[PDB]
């Protein structure tokens, strides 16, 4: 309902505590805490239409992004840094990569991740879900088992949620790389990994299996 | 299998209905949008009155090949694109159709086109290539009152209009009518002369005031490697002409007893543009069971305008078509001395939008026949050599001033496909049109007679 | 000199020009031969000799620009528009200034 | 601008202008001649889709812009967004020019 386009760089706490109705397009890039406490608002961050950068090979948002969020969407054509989605309690986000300590202590929301993830991913993540595009099958070396599992997508209701988010990501973000994964879904879906909290396995309306 | 007029646009006398429909608008957008700047309101008004001769005259004045253009012009891209009525339910007027009709009746009349009295008479002028560009240039020059000869490599005249554009779209008698009108002017055409070893610009310099280089883009694109027709492979350059020869009666004296090329089984046509779609349609003409049109790029960015793609679509040709990046043909596999299949890689567009080919994903498409549609280009070295000293751009094409269409050499001009800048019959005719005034200015200067500026 | 009192806040052409333009147009009709009156593109742009601000080309680029939403496309439209011969008095005015340029961000 | 200035009334009222302004410079020049607000119609019409075919009095608009007829109105593809863009550009184009002249506003 109120959308504010901004070229440039956002300083710390972009969109902090934004409720629904508010949309922030940042064309350029942003600092730490994008979406800190997101509360139903939507934040988007993508490079300039004139930047020669390859979306998914560069950083674009900082650290502690979406810390403690409870609602809203966040879309970012690029990598996030450290402790991304830490404590996310309910925001949905698509991002093209991310630092270490990802999705830590997450208790809700969904987190798609278009690329490499760093160490200790998912540690302490008791609930929400994360998909994670992994071209080299390395997710296994970076993840933190203790409370979560990962499997290839099997049920297709999940396979669908993924696809749709990624389409949203594109839409907003106008992201090639993502646009391309969709162009080749069939073979590409094959490469994500559904990351699902142990304690949510049995609570979950549509089982994740079969 | 057979070549009836597929054009949706073609109109019977019923054209009267649409003529009345035309708003006959002031400072009409359609004319502004026409390359030759035809006075569409007036010719259309004319047909509305029923005086076909008047419209025909109006059409011919601006373009010498009014007939062919009416049939062929990608109007949506052109004059009809800015037709005001498009706002209406009925939609835009089919200006191309009315142009064809008015033109056709004129053909029936059999009137000859007279010369205007006189001008700086004419040191020999030579034009190379019998296509739209040269014919237009030659006719305008003759209107000026010069003696001109067009040297054509092939036995047939008309350029692509004759050679490649299908009979179902472009009847041969049409091209013949226009060439004859030009001929009445006294333009002389001689058929087995080539700009190459036989003819060169320096040779012409031996007595020749000016030259226009009309030869177009004679050859086709590369990947097939030595592949033979017997095996399967045919370039658009090879394929279209053979169908043309069998299909169009006046084109060659010899009857292609060989008959239409026998195309059987699945046919793969590679190309986005006009060329690919025409080959797809012509293929069914020669008995193809199925035709697949493969595009490197995405469906959205098909090069040909919708009317022509429509013809292939109605035809039931399948378009495997996805991602801006190239379904790109890696290799053709031949077994049994016949092409069994073509190997492709999938391609997809990145944010950069630069095309990417993903080697991991491959497609093996079975095909008995492959026709490569990619396009044409100049590459024949003796031809290029013929051209010296004239400067070539880093597109390896003759450089010309956009306005004058003059080459580095003042005496030599160029127009049409060779310029690489437009790929339509009406732009090619326009090129010749514009050139003619400039060659005229140049020659008259030789005469030591001025030309105004306004040109007319 | 010749008409009642009327303002003419900018002298313009005079007898000499008038003379000239009159005569040119006269040639066109006698010092040559003529079939019909041209079309005209006064009351409406045809792709004639009477130009107009809004002619198809520019319109396209505009529409484009503002649909695809590229400032860049916008920027070629304005150029299409700014590079013609003068058609309007502002068109006769350059803009020089004596300060040195400042960064857009400011 | 002048007269009002000459009578010392020129600060009492704001001046606005319109007429074919299509462009950044068109706007700057207007300002320097003294205007403070600029009116933009046609061009904003065109962005909502006018194709300049002049049949506004006729009620046959190819594009849903100047027409009361229903069927025709359904051909309309105007967008708040499109217009918003139009202004957005003009503006930036203006700031571009100013910074050229060394002025920051
Ligand atoms: C398959 C296909 C379909 C098309 N469909 C359409 C359509 O629907 N509508 C449309 O508007 N346009 C269409 N076009 C494009 C149109 O045909 C060309 O733009 C137009 O014919 C170019 O005219 P031209 O005179 O430059 O050259 P052509 O290429 O038309 O003419 C060149 C002439 O030079 C001769 N020549 C070549 N080399 C030499 C030499 N060394 N010495 C002497 N003579 C030589 C050739 O034999 C030929 O007669 C199509 C093109 C192709 C290939
Ligand atoms: C279709 C149309 C309708 C208009 N209606 C009015 C009107 O109702 N009242 C009015 O005061 N001016 C009216 N105007 C004129 C504009 O309000 C403004 O003065 C001028 O239209 C801008 O024209 P421009 O885009 O060439 O700059 C109208 C103009 C157009 C094109
Ligand atoms: S005069 Fe031209 S084709 Fe006829 S209605 Fe279409 S724009 Fe006016
Ligand atoms: S020559 Fe001009 S562009 Fe082709 S008015 Fe006729 S079909 Fe249209
Ligand atoms: S095109 Fe614009 S011109 Fe008027 S008639 Fe339609 S609103």
Swiss-Prot record, chain B:
Pfam families: Fer4_20, Pyr_redox_2. It comes from the Bacteria. GO terms for biological process: L-glutamate biosynthetic process. Pathway: Amino-acid biosynthesis; L-glutamate biosynthesis via GLT pathway; L-glutamate from 2-oxoglutarate and L-glutamine (NADP(+) route): step 1/1; Energy metabolism; nitrogen metabolism. Aggregate of 4 catalytic active heterodimers, consisting of a large and a small subunit. GO terms for molecular function: 4 iron, 4 sulfur cluster binding; glutamate synthase (NADPH) activity; metal ion binding. PANTHER family: GLUTAMATE SYNTHASE [NADPH] SMALL CHAIN (PTHR42783), GLUTAMATE SYNTHASE [NADPH] SMALL CHAIN-RELATED (PTHR42783:SF3). Residues 13-46 form the 4Fe-4S ferredoxin-type domain. This is Glutamate synthase [NADPH] small chain. Glutamine binds to the large subunit and transfers the amido group to 2-oxo-glutamate that apparently binds to the small subunit. InterPro entries: DPD_II, FAD/NAD-bd_sf, FAD/NAD-binding_dom, GltD-like, Helical_ferredxn. [4Fe-4S] cluster binds at residues 69, 73, 79, 83. Keywords: 4Fe-4S, Amino-acid biosynthesis, Glutamate biosynthesis, Iron, Iron-sulfur, Metal-binding, NADP, Oxidoreductase. Its cofactor is [4Fe-4S] cluster. Its EC number is 1.4.1.13. The keyword NADP applies. It catalyses: 2 L-glutamate + NADP(+) = L-glutamine + 2-oxoglutarate + NADPH + H(+). Binds 1 [4Fe-4S] cluster.
UniProtKB/Swiss-Prot annotation, chain C:
Glutamine binds to the large subunit and transfers the amido group to 2-oxo-glutamate that apparently binds to the small subunit. Belongs to the glutamate synthase family. Aggregate of 4 catalytic active heterodimers, consisting of a large and a small subunit. This is Glutamate synthase [NADPH] large chain. It comes from Azospirillum brasilense. The lineage of its organism: Bacteria, Pseudomonadati, Pseudomonadota, Alphaproteobacteria, Rhodospirillales. The gene is gltB. The chain holds residues 773 to 878 of 1515 of the full protein.
């Amino acid at each position: 309902h109120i959308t504010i386009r901004l070229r440039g760089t956002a300083g710390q706490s972009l969109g902090a505590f934004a409720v629904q109705g508010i949309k922030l397009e940042v064309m350029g890039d942003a600092n730490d805490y994008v979406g800190k406490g997101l509360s139903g608002g939507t934040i988007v961050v993508r490079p300039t239409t004139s930047s020669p950068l390859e979306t998914n090979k560069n950083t674009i948002i900082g650290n502690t992004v979406l810390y403690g969020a409870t609602a809203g969407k966040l879309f970012a054509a690029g990598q996030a840094g450290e402790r991304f989605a830490v404590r996310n309690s309910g925001a949905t986000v698509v991002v093209e990569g991310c630092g270490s300590n990802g999705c830590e202590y997450m208790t809700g929301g969904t987190a798609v991740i278009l690329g490499r993830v760093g160490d200790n991913f998912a540690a302490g993540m008791t609930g929400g879900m994360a998909y994670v595009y992994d071209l080299d099958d390395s997710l296994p070396l970076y993840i933190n088992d203790e409370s979560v599992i990962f499997q290839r997508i099997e049920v297709g209701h999940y396979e669908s949620q993924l696809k749709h988010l990624i389409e949203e990501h594109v839409t907003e973000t106008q992201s090639r790389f993502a646009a391309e994964i969709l162009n080749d879904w069939a073979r590409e879906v094959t490469k994500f990994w559904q990351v699902v909290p142990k304690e949510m396995l049995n609570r979950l309306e549509v089982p994740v299996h079969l | 299998q057979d070549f009836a007029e597929i054009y949706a646009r073609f109109s019977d006398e019923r054209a009267n209905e649409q003529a009345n429909r035309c708003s006959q608008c002031g400072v009409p957008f359609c004319q502004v949008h026409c390359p030759v700047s035809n006075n569409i309101p007036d010719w259309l008004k004319l047909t509305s009155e029923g005086r076909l001769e008047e419209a025909y005259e109006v059409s011919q004045a601006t373009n010498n090949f009014p007939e062919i253009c009416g049939r062929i012009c990608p109007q949506d891209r052109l004059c009809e694109g800015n037709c005001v009525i498009e706002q209406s339910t009925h939609g835009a007027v089919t200006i191309g159709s009315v142009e064809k009709y008015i033109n056709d009746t004129a053909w029936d009349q059999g009137w000859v086109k007279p010369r205007t009295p006189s001008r700086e008479l004419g040191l020999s002028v030579g034009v190379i290539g019998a296509g739209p560009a040269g014919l237009a240039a030659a006719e305008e020059l003759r209107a000026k009152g010069y003696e001109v000869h067009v040297y054509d490599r092939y036995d047939r005249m008309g350029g692509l209009l004759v050679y490649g554009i299908p009979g179902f779209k472009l009847e041969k008698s049409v091209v013949e009518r226009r060439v004859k009108l030009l001929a009445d002017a006294g333009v002389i055409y001689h058929p087995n002369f080539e700009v190459g070893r036989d003819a060169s610009l320096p040779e012409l310099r031996r007595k020749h005031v000016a030259v226009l280089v009309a030869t177009g883009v004679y050859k086709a694109r590369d990947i097939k490697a030595p592949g033979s027709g017997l095996g399967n492979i045919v370039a658009a350059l090879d394929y279209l002409t053979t169908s043309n020869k069998v299909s169009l009666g006046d084109t060659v004296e010899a009857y292609e007893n060989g008959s239409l090329n026998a195309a059987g089984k699945h046919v793969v046509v590679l190309g986005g543009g006009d060329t690919a779609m025409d080959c797809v349609r012509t293929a069914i003409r020669q008995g193809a069971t199925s035709v697949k049109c493969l595009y490197r790029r995405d469906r959205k960015n098909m090069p040909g305008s919708q009317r022509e793609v429509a013809h292939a679509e109605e035809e039931g040709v399948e378009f495997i078509w996805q991602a801006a990046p190239e379904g790109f043909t890696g290799d053709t596999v031949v077994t049994g001395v016949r092409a069994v299949r073509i190997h492709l890689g999938v391609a997809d567009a990145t944010g950069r939008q630069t095309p990417q080919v993903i080697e991991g994903s491959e497609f093996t498409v079975q095909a008995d026949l492959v026709i490569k549609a990619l396009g044409f280009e100049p590459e024949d070295l003796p031809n290029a050599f013929d051209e010296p000293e004239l400067k070539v751009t880093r597109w390896g094409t003759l450089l010309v001033d956009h306005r004058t269409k003059m080459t580095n050499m003042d005496g030599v001009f160029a127009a049409g496909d060779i310029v690489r800048g437009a790929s339509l019959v009406v732009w090619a005719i326009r090129d010749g049109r514009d050139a003619a005034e400039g060659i005229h200015a140049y020659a008259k200067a030789k005469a030591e007679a001025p030309v105004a500026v306004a040109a007319e | 000199e010749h008409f009642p009192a009327m303002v003419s806040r900018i002298s313009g052409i005079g007898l000499n020009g008038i003379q000239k333009k009159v005569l040119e147009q006269h040639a066109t009709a006698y010092n040559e031969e003529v079939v019909a009156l041209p079309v005209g593109g006064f009351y409406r742009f045809r792709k004639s000799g009477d130009r107009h601000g809004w002619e198809g080309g520019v319109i396209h680029t505009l529409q484009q620009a503002v649909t695809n939403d590229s400032y860049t496309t916008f920027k070629k439209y304005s150029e299409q528009v700014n590079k013609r011969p003068p058609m309007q008095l502002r068109d006769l005015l350059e803009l020089r200034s004596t300060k040195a340029p400042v960064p857009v961000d400011e | 601008h002048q007269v009002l200035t000459l009578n010392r009334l020129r600060h009492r009222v704001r001046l606005r202008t319109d007429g074919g302004l299509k462009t950044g410079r068109d706007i700057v020049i207007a300002a320097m001649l003294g205007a403070e607000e600029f009116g933009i119609g046609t061009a904003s019409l065109i962005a909502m889709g006018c194709i300049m075919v002049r049949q506004c009095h006729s009620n046959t608009c190819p594009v849903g812009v100047c027409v009361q007829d229903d069927k025709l109105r359904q051909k309309f593809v105007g967008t708040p967004e499109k217009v918003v863009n139009l202004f957005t550009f003009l503006a930036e184009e203006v700031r571009e020019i100013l910074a050229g002249l060394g002025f920051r506003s």
